[PDB]
Design a protein around this ligand. Sequence first.
Ligand SMILES: *[C@@H]1O[C@H](CO)[C@@H](O[C@@H]2O[C@H](CO)[C@@H](O)[C@H](O)[C@H]2NC(C)=O)[C@H](O)[C@H]1NC(C)=O
Ligand code: NAG
Lengths: 50, 50
Amino acid sequence: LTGTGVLTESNKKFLPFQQFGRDIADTTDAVRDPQTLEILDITPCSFGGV
Amino acid sequence: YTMSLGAENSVAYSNNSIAIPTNFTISVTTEILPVSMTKTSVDCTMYICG
Ligand SMILES: *[C@@H]1O[C@H](CO)[C@@H](O[C@@H]2O[C@H](CO)[C@@H](O)[C@H](O)[C@H]2NC(C)=O)[C@H](O)[C@H]1NC(C)=O
Ligand SMILES: *[C@@H]1O[C@H](CO)[C@@H](O)[C@H](O)[C@H]1NC(C)=O
């Protein structure tokens, strides 16, 4: 899963069998680290009309 | 059912009959209009090309 974003700790629990989660946009919105099984949110990098 | 068009009312017409109001009600009929759409703007290259 290649992409760009702001990784943070996340509060919402995955069930043990889940590997990652999605926005309604189908774009990923949270992930498990495959080495240490903690859940990270993937917030978008900040943007706006200059 | 076949819908009602409202109650029927044969108006009590004649060449010499008038109905004049003895009394009134003031009434405060609310009317609602939209005015501003939500101000969307889209970065079409971030939408299309990520
Ligand atoms: C005109 O209509 C109003 C109601 O819309 C009447 O006012 C009421 O009068 C009774 C006594 O007759 C009171 O007990 C009510 O409290 C009044 N209602 C309100 C909202 O104040 C009024 O009397 C009528 N007047 C005539 C001359 O027909
Ligand atoms: C793999 O990563 C975890 C921590 O993410 C670590 O505990 C483990 O020791 C690593 N594997 C090896 C062979 O060191």
